[PDB]
Design a protein around this ligand. Structure first.
Ligand code: ZN
Lengths: 287, 139, 191
């Protein structure tokens, strides 16, 4: 009867694989597996993550083929992936990220081996692209109903676990159910590689290609945009002619939500492109 | 920091570890080592305990204890005796004044609160010695 | 039972189709591979058998597998091109022995040579020194001949073969009407 504080380690591997699984997150019920190695009790790491072929039966304990499972696992053993399965993941599109009866039953059946059995549910469908943040799931014992619910230390991370702030599902399904915190890990190799690759993704091959293009497009394309900018600015100025009257009348309080400033500032920011590319053209002409 | 102006190492350690309670809560037990008692010392000899009573220029009622709910202009002398010195504010060290009629006085004039000894001016009998406690929760 | 890996090399040249000796003995030694792999199947079915040729470009027809079912189908289309190659033919097998599944299986590689060796004694004794260094069992089998049977090949085998006790054996088959099956089944390496 001992319980410690566990934290699920998530890398970019499983994340991206769950993004591809997000593209695979069609309403048809799907299956997934997670692999890794357990160094100790209170830490869990996942590395190898793959998908599973779809079926008409949907998610079930019968849907998982044991011989095919062990086969693929053996194929992973002969290769450079010597990690045991740490659990299984799936998708629950549109009816919520919670777990049904069959799901918690096959979870109960799959947790017979591993005491941990990390449960991850991804649902990109109603999830905005603003945040990819996901919440891992856990299974409480049925014999702990007499004593306290969660005997876990390090309560400082519950505020980080407060991200699902929804006022329904949380304390609604809180009975015999709970969750676990999620953190990531990054080294220098992944950092430098991904940063350089992304910067290059926002850049060009020789990087000198599409610059001079816009530099020479300043006299064609941008000019029209500058004319339109002058049109909108004048459309503001005609009201700005009406403004000093109000400034000569009330001056108390602001009934106009329009700032009229920062937008024109941004217009100037778009106007600075000519100045910034001027030196560029100078460098091109010079040498 | 200390009275001499130097900072206490176990105090800084204690309070920083106290701020380290975020990661590990049981580590907050090191706060007890950062506790610094505020008082004076009227002790002259190791086996001899005298009694020194001074006076203050402020109100004793203002320096008293804020007794909570039950739920079942100048003081003649300080409340500190048998030296059991109570809590003392560093700002109250400037307002204390030694009695001119006091029998026992140190060789060094007392100005700011700190660690000092007591010197016998009379060098005679009747040192007013008090007994020692008995067995219990402590040693 | 016995845990070991089996690597068989077949000669894809046109010297096997000659009219003096057996009428395209490739099929005969194919049947030999069949009966010895079925023998190994009867003894220890968990053993895997790989297949590759001695030609210039090394191309694996079938990866090592306990099931010879598809192997029997892959025994066809020998692609009769090239002549012979030795060094990279060794390096494509002995160095590829690390790709096996079971790590408890012993390393055993044989060869069928129907063509004269183009490599000098230097490469021979060097590669033999390498195989002796990494300690891999090698069985030399030569079907058909032009020049003298064993000249430098004797010293080659002697230098290649270490651990005299229960070590490797040399198989030398002369011309004759009899098949190669019962002839290569004579040593202890077969069955
Ligand atoms: Zn559903």
């Amino acid at each position: 009867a001992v319980d410690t504080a566990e934290q699920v380690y998530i890398s970019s591997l499983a994340l991206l694989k769950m993004l591809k699984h997000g593209r695979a997150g069609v309403p048809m019920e799907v299956m997934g597996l997670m692999l890794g190695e357990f160094v100790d009790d209170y830490t869990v790491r996942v590395i190898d993550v793959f998908a599973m072929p779809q079926s008409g039966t949907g998610v079930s304990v019968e849907a998982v083929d044991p011989v095919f499972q062990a086969k693929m696992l053996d194929m992973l053993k002969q290769t450079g992936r010597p990690e045991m399965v740490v659990g299984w993941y799936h998708s629950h599109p549109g009816f919520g990220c919670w777990l049904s009866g069959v799901d918690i039953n096959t979870q109960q059946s799959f947790e017979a081996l591993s005491e941990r059995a990390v449960a991850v549910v991804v649902d990109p469908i109603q999830s905005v692209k603003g945040k990819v943040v996901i919440d891992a799931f856990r299974l409480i014992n049925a014999n702990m109903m007499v004593l306290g619910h969660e005997p876990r230390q390090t309560t400082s991370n519950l505020g980080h676990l407060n991200k699902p702030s929804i006022q329904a599902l949380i304390h609604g399904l809180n009975r015999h159910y709970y969750s676990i915190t999620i953190n990531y890990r990054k080294n220098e190799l992944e950092q430098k590689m991904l940063l350089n690759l992304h910067k290059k993704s926002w850049m060009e091959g020789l990087t000198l290609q599409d610059y001079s293009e816009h530099c020479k497009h300043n006299e064609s394309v941008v000019k029209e945009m500058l004319e339109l900018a002058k049109n909108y600015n004048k459309a503001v100025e005609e009201e700005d002619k009406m403004t000093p009257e109000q400034l000569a009348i009330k001056n108390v309080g602001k009934q106009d939500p329009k700032r009229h400033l920062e937008e024109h500032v941004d217009v100037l920011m778009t106007s600075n492109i000519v100045q910034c590319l001027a030196a560029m053209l100078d460098t091109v002409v010079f040498k | 920091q200390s009275r001499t102006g130097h900072t206490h190492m176990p105090s800084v350690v204690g309070v920083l570890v106290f701020t380290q309670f975020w990661f590990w809560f049981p580590l907050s037990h090191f706060l007890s080592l950062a506790y610094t008692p505020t008082c004076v010392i009227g002790l002259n000899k190791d086996l001899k305990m005298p009694k020194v009573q001074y006076k203050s220029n402020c109100k004793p009622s203002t320096f008293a204890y804020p007794a909570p709910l039950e739920v079942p202009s100048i003081t003649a002398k300080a409340k500190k005796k048998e030296k059991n010195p109570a809590r003392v504010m560093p700002a109250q060290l400037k307002v204390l004044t030694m009695p001119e009629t006091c029998r026992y006085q140190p060789f060094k004039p007392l100005s700011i609160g700190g660690i000092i000894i007591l010197k016998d001016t009379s060098e005679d009998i009747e040192e007013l010695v008090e007994p020692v406690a008995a067995h219990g929760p402590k040693i | 039972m016995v845990l070991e890996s089996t690597m068989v090399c077949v000669d894809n040249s046109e010297y096997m189709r000659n009219g003096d000796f057996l009428p395209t003995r490739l099929q005969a030694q194919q049947d030999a591979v069949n009966i010895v792999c079925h023998s190994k199947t009867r003894s220890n079915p968990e053993n895997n058998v790989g297949l590759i040729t001695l030609a210039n470009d090394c191309e694996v027809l079938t990866t090592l597998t306990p099931d010879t079912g598809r192997i029997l189908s892959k025994l066809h289309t020998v692609q009769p091109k090239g002549k012979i190659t030795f060094c990279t033919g060794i390096r494509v097998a002995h160095l590829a022995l690390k790709h096996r599944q079971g790590k408890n299986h012993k390393m055993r590689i044989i060869a069928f040579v129907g063509s004269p060796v183009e490599d000098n004694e230097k490469d021979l004794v060097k590669l033999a020194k390498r195989l002796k260094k990494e300690k891999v069992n090698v069985d030399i089998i030569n079907f058909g001949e032009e020049e003298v049977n064993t000249e430098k090949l004797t010293a080659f085998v002697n230098t290649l073969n270490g651990k005299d006790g229960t070590g490797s054996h040399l198989v030398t088959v002369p011309p004759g009407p009899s098949l190669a099956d019962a002839l290569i089944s004579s040593p202890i390496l077969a069955g």
